[PDB]
Amino acid sequence: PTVKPPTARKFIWTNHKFNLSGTPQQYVPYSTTRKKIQEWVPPSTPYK
Amino acid sequence: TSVKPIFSRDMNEAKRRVRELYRAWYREVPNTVHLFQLDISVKQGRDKVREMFKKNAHITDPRVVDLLVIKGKMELEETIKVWKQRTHVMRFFHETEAPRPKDFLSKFYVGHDP
Amino acid sequence: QLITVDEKLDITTITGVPEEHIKTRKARIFVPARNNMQSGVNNTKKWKMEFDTRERWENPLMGWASTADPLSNLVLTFSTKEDAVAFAEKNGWSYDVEERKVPKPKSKSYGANFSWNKRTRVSTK
Amino acid sequence: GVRTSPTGEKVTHTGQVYDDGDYRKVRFVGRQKEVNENFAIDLIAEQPVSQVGSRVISCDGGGGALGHPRVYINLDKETKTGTCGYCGLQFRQQ
Amino acid sequence: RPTVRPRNDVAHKQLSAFGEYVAEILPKYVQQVQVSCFNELEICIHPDGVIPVLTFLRDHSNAQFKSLADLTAVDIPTRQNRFEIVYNLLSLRFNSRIRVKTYTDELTPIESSVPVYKAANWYEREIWDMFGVFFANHPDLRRILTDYGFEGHPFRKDFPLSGYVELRYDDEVKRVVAEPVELAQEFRKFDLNSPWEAFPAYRQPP
Amino acid sequence: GLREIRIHLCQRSPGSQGVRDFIEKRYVELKKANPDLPILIRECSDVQPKLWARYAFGQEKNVSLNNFSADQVTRALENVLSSKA
Amino acid sequence: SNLIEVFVDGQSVMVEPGTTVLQACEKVGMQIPRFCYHERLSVAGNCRMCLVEIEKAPKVVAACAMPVMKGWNILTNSEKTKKAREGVMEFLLANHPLDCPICDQGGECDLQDQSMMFGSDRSRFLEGKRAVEDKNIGPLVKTIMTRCIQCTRCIRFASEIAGVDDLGTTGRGNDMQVGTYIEKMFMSELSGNIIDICPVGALTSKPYAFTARPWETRKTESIDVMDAVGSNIVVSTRTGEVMRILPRMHEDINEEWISDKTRFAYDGLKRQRLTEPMVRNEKGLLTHTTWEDALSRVAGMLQSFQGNDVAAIAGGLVDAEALIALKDLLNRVDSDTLCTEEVFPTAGAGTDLRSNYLLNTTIAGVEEADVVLLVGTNPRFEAPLFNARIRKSWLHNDLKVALIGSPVDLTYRYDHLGDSPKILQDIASGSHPFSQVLQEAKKPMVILGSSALQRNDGAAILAAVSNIAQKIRTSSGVTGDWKVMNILHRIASQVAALDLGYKPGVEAIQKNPPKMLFLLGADGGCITRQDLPKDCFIVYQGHHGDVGAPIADVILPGAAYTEKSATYVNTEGRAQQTKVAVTPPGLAREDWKIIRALSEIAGMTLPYDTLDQVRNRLEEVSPNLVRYDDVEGANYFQQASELSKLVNQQLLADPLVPPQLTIKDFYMTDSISRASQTMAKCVKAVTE
């Protein structure tokens, strides 16, 4: 890279990270989608 | 309605092979409980053998009975020859399976299945 | 040498299926409807057998669709509805058969687009 | 475009966030919620609209065969810009 | 034509002639004879003919199919006899291959071909294991590929892909146990067939 | 006592012919006499004709009308209309 | 005798004269490729994909439009035919955009697939492509018109099926564009069908956009419940979520169309759902609870009441299995107050005779009628697929249609006789000239809208309309087996409830206000707490929190029509069943199972434990309810008309005015479509 440097992009990490497994920086998986079904919320005033 | 037989030509002939298989299984349980160091009693093992035989009591096709005996003898051979391990023998007893609900109300409370 | 066997063919005891997935299932025997998004009719030639849909739930970790139904993906293909019914009968599944729906023959006439006195005349081409 | 919910969890670019009563956020306790901070919707918006002289322009996303399939964008409407369906670049007929 | 597989008419003619030859000599058993467009000869026989037909092809001076390349089954549920038994044979003398096919259902035994080819021993065990076809007079018929005590015949078209049970280690009983299968992600069924016919040459009459 | 009458019959089977005669001749007069009683007539092809009576608290009886004549149908109707099972 | 012999690749086939070349190929199982041809639209002949060689003829013919001649041999696989297909496909793809990855049609595209099967495998087009600007035609149909191949299917469908002449072509040659020219929205109750018939991704569903690919969807064949037509549908699901609704072809019901409410209201199933049992807490507010606790509270009250103190109302979307289960449960406490929200006059025969409340002619029978008299109905919005059948007979059979009621736009021209109910007497008396049309007619059809029977004088209107149909049958002008009298229902659950012996309307409840009321998906607000004693115990069972739920003491979450296998009977009396596409959300349960579970806890166990057993029960009450897809005839119109004359009732002076006069009134009619955000967008679009 001192002779053929990589192409620069604004989104490329400026700071490389090594393997973070076993540390508080480890990746934890989760679902990235929002709730699919909306439940009906009952009214907040008595009226039976 | 004219088919090739497997071993038996009628139910009486087939029912003989069933009885011979039952005796073989009956006499093998004590050695199975000892060889595999099972924690079940000999009575439990025989009670399990009888239960396995009884759920097939409604069969009236000799060819189906012949295959059940054929498969039952393979299972016995696997056991007597210790091809099975302890896990395989105890799989008949479903020890880690919790009791599923049988009545309508219990099934209704837990899920949608019939 | 052959023998005589008059009992109805029944193999439920030698197929290895657990009891739950024999008695409590409902097989549907049908010819799939044409996908309305396409005009091709080649997926409507054969009879199919599928089973009743059971619960799918969200996996707590990733949100993937989990299932406990071993038959959820099973789909068999048959030449005729007799073959499908025969298969369902010997496996002990209760079933529903829906009669094949064939598009009824239409009367087409390009000339009607320009009728002298009928409503079939088209206002645009 | 990362913002934090009232409970402090970062919201993803897909809008995902565990709500206040969700037990599932226990998975981040002692660890972290991985969130990418380069929101593409924000980055594409910064790109200037490209002024062209023709009614129809083509976009392949740049880089020739390293971009996307080449598509042609009609620029007759004057109210809005033409937007590439693959890469989001915008065009306008001067 | 660079992209088209060339035809071989000489081999097609030779195989067709031998197919009629076999059909003339064992009419008692031969039901159908066909040669494919890529020149593979198939003999379809009544299941009673397994031993006579295989013996003839192994031993006859104009056949000498001394090697059993493969023996397998195919499950076709729409057929009354759902299992198609396929023997693939090789003749080193005449540098030729032939395929013999018969059929059976769930309850009809097929005669074991171990007397003709010792190679058939394990192939028949595999067919029994994976399809449940019983071979009569086998020296030792039992499962070969599946776990001990495994129920069912997985290669049948109606056996579910992931099966009915799955295994895990249970600490309470200190052993591996089997339990009904639950999948964190269900296998996703895809409907891929195009609604437009691809091959007119194989169109079935309506 | 009585809460609901139901009559099942086929539209064309000869076994339902008597029920068909009863409906076309006597049902209208029956309905006039029992103005506030549900008499659910339900035709279905190839079904054996039947007479269902429902009493208080969901008790039901069913009488077969197969091959009955219009008179027997009348008789069966009178038996149900005088019961309190 | 009439048939002529033609040959398809040498195979003889006998066809009626006028059969096209394409149709003759169908007869031997050969499907000619096509784009512009649709068998339910007028022939166009413009795409040229159907060109086929005729043996000994130098010129290929357009198979879709060319009538087959005697002795012709149609070569469907000849070199000339194949090269013709390759050439046409090459032209179709020359300007087509490289959009497949971003285009929703991908994977179920007739352009893709016929390119794969009949086109070349490469391009020799070296120029730049056409690009066309997009048209906004409303919130339902997205347009990406650069994909349009100018097949004119959408134009023909709009003009012929929908009866709306807003789509057309502007310009000429390669610049010819499909659209409305001006800025106009294509808002029709059948508009969404142009998505299906557009062979390419030029017209696509806005709600569905980008969410799924065809190969990954599971298809569940079901039935629509948004009206009483009983349209057959396919519910596409993926990984446990309903993705979209598609028509399913049924020649005798909806053909291959569905209404926009049937197509797009499914997104209401994801909103305002009831997922847990709820009971009122000490402060009078609904709070989540277990099934055990919720049913114990309901069972306690049920055991403490009898007879007229217990009543039930069934809503519009309720299935037959639940209807009989609730009827059985209330009968076991000697309660017979099983009511529906939709009224049907009980005067005379009432619900004793099916023919009194059925569309006896059937939907397909409209095509055989010669005069249709519509009374007090707007079938365009009450039964869109039924109105489409009327227009089809109007278009092809020259059917004469007359209306009594508000002069709504029906998409075809009709004779407006007026909105006064008094016209029925004039026609029956013979003074009115239109009565002479009915006498001359051989197969007249008289249709009374159920929405008209919701008036206070519904019994009088039903009697008056029946009197007309009885005069027609007394005049001997009709065949004999042809049925004249018809009732056009608008509620999916109505006919099954009448079949089971429910009381139509909530009049019985208003006479004897019960102490315990069951609301089974009853969201019409017919009975509110003002009409009930101060302490009335209200149990709501349903799938949506809408009108009934907020007033209830106990909420039992039920299943929607996509989440159960349930029996619905359409306006003709045809029983059909849905299938489970996805299971009910949360703790919701199948509706008949809830009632069966409640019966056990209340010490009154119902005698059925499975879907098959409760369907055996339905057969005992009304045998037709288990004859799926069958239309069982109903007789005894003469006996019904006699009882109809026994009691005299006066027509009110009010004009007949249907509940839905314009498209804005069509989109929201039930709890599912009221919760649908797509339906709200449609309402906003057509009003603003």
Ligand code: SF4
């Ligand atoms: S319409 Fe068909 S061919 Fe055209 S971009 Fe869409 S998927 Fe591809």
Ligand code: SF4
């Ligand atoms: S928009 Fe679709 S249906 Fe209409 S002309 Fe274009 S391709 Fe045909």
Ligand code: FES
């Ligand atoms: S399908 Fe015949 S020209 Fe278009």
Ligand SMILES: [K+]
């Ligand atoms: K489309």
Ligand SMILES: [Zn+2]
């Ligand atoms: Zn781009």
